């Protein structure tokens, strides 16, 4: 009876959130005034890194001044590629140092590695769907220039901001009281992880190999100690690094800024109500699921949370 009640209020809360997403556009998530930072593709990768760090961002649309076209987004992945190229080609330090953003495609070719957008006026639910299935944590908001008839970046919408927008407007999240363990939305199987002595380069390899935002760092006995995020790669490359390539992840983590907000953990008995509370109060990108004693059992990311909201169990 009490578990049947918990279950119906959850459905009630989910159906309400869903209706909110179907009733709002991506444009509605936009602040009334905001900044869009765009980088000309002839800018040095080196300098574009400083731009991102100065302005507390991790992504920026790219603009080709020769063709008057947008040319995709700069993300941590691009910097992974540069690191991987350099590690494999340590002789090419000069090329890497003078690498321009439009030279990024040649780096990709040398490595042999292979973008969703949405019209702002479209339903926010639809923006959530497209972002999920593009396997990206971001979606550029693109419209058409009324004069030139050209594709224009209006903004970049992130999973975090969407979930925060939901959380802020919809206090019904409080009634999502089913433990996440009973919801079958945590990834438990085939956790890609490493240890403190694992070379950072191999962890970076794991990032692109698994197509994941972070690698959990455990000890011999499976206790979660820390995490390596793709975001950390920016810090790693900052100021040009060469001796600090074959470094261990533990060593590389000392580059982390003192205002690093930390890694979030939870257990299977935590509720999405609490999870949304945290998203609402702080920029949290995932919750690593541990057991009673702090051993890693799994992870609950923003994409998992959003997938549940849209699709269910």
């Amino acid at each position: 009876d009490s578990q049947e009640k918990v279950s119906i209020e959850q459905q009630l809360a989910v159906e309400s959130i869903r209706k909110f997403l179907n009733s709002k556009t991506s444009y509605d998530v936009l602040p009334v005034s905001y900044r869009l930072i765009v980088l000309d593709t002839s800018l040095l990768v080196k300098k574009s890194l400083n731009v991102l760090l100065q302005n507390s961002i991790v992504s920026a649309p790219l603009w080709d001044s020769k063709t008057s076209r947008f040319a995709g987004l700069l993300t941590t992945t691009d910097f992974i590629n540069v690191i991987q190229y350099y590690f494999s080609n340590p002789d090419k330090f000069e090329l890497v140092d003078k690498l321009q953003l439009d030279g990024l495609k040649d780096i990709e070719r040398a490595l042999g590695v292979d973008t969703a957008s949405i019209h702002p006026s479209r339903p926010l639910f639809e923006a959530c769907l497209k972002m999920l299935e593009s396997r990206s944590g971001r979606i550029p908001l693109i419209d058409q220039d009324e004069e030139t008839h050209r594709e224009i970046v209006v903004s970049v919408l992130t999973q975090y901001r969407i979930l925060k927008f939901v959380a802020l407007n919809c206090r019904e999240t409080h009634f999502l009281k089913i433990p996440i363990g009973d919801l079958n939305i945590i990834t438990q199987d085939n956790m890609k992880s490493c240890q403190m002595t694992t070379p950072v380069i191999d962890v970076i390899q794991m990032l692109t190999q698994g197509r994941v935002s972070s690698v959990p760092i455990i000890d011999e006995n499976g206790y979660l100690i820390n995490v390596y995020e793709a975001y950390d790669v920016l810090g790693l490359i900052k100021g040009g690094i060469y001796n600090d390539l074959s470094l261990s992840v533990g060593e590389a983590l000392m580059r982390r800024s003192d205002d690093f907000e930390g890694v979030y953990t939870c257990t299977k008995n935590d509720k999405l109500s609490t999870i949304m509370d945290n998203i609402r109060k702080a920029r949290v990108h995932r919750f690593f699921v541990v057991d009673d004693v702090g051993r890693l059992v799994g992870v609950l990311t923003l994409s998992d949370i959003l997938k549940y909201i849209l699709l269910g169990s």
């Binding site: 765009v38 000309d40 760090l53 100065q54 302005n55 507390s56 603009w63 001044s65 008057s68 220039d145 009324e146 004069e147 030139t148 008839h149 050209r150 224009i152 970046v153 979660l224 100690i225 820390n226 995490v227 810090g235 900052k238 100021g239 600090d244 470094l247 533990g250 060593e251 983590l253 000392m254 580059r255 982390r256 800024s257 003192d258 690093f260 907000e261 930390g262 890694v263 979030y264 953990t265 939870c266 257990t267 008995n269 935590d270 609490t274 999870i275 945290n278 919750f287 690593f288």
Partner: protein, 138 residues
């Protein structure tokens, strides 16, 4: 109730301290990245210490060398340049205006005006060309 925590060993101060206690040599060598996010001072357009006709002269020379065209100004609007720049509409329109801040201090205001046979980046890129041309000719 809530078992949502921040992992203490994930925090820089504890991670460092554990690495130092483990004896790691890189613990003392590696310092945390301190990104000095310095607030940039923003201004509309560019300022100039030269005088009106001199400044207006400089601007037109830049415009001409950059391949732009402009209207013939009347007496009432001498310090206004209604220009057109080659770069589906083909020609970008700009309105440049000279303002006075002080007797020796002037501001060159640039305004996007449209297209002739929305995104500000074509406009921003062109003003970039213009600003750079003006800096050389000084």
């Amino acid at each position: 109730d809530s078992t949502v925590s921040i992992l203490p060993t994930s925090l820089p101060q504890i991670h460092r301290a554990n690495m130092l206690a483990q004896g790691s040599p890189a613990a003392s060598k590696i310092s945390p990245l301190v990104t000095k996010k310095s607030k940039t001072r923003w201004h509309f357009g560019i300022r100039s210490r030269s005088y009106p006709l001199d400044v207006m002269g400089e601007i037109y020379i830049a415009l001409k060398n950059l391949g732009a065209e402009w209207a013939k100004p009347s007496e009432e609007d001498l310090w206004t340049i209604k220009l057109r720049w080659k770069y589906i509409p083909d020609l970008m329109k700009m309105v440049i205006q000279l303002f006075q801040i002080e007797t020796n201090n002037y501001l060159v205001d640039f305004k996007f005006d449209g297209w002739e046979s929305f995104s500000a980046y074509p406009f921003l890129h062109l003003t970039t060309k213009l600003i750079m041309e003006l800096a050389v000719n000084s």
